[PDB]
Amino acid sequence: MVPAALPQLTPTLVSLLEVIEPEVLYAGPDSAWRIMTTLNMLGGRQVIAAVKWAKAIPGFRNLHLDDQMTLLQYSWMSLMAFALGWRSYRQASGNLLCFAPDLIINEQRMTLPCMYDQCKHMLFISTELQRLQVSYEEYLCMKTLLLLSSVPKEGLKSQELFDEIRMTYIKELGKAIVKREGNSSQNWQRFYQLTKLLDSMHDVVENLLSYCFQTFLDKSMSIEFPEMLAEIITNQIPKYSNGNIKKLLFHQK
């Protein structure tokens, strides 16, 4: 028994990331066509929550408005897929996609026709967070980095500020790793491993956007998307297809 109180915020970026992280949404089917539509409807709500989150990230609102909109359009799938991997990893109940507490997709549904090829890519993130035993603090830092990982080939209007902000979260990820109390050698190796995982998110996202864009465009397929998601995808596609989305990588590849 303790009184009602808000936990103590400290002067560190990760303490702030923890307070601004949105609460997990509840969603509120045995056919791939129906499952897909349902996932999209959830996704639109999660994306609205993500925009509100990004505006709270120290430095973000100081970027030109066009910069903010572009970063969100380029990175939303990465942010949604990484958070899905996290919820699924933290479920610790086997190969299961935890879209929401009331919307879990088990092995049986993941193997329905038309589902496996898309679910396997989402599951990959989960198994990687699990293999590396990623901590909540590391996850919050990495998730922020995904918002700052895809830029226009021609550069942002607020390029210098963006670079500074990005470096701030790269260091914060380094502090989250150090905090686990491994030795110097383990710290170096872990930074390597987590930055490799960040880089691998670009490939995951390419696989997901392929489904996103095709299902959105083929109106005959009758897969529905909410308004917010529809508007973003509508604006993203031209940039994506024109090869304008530059992926920032930690490793040469």
Binding site: Q68, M69, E227, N235
Partner: peptide
Amino acid sequence: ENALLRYLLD
């Protein structure tokens, strides 16, 4: 064009 995203961001 991006009215919804713009609104949310303002």
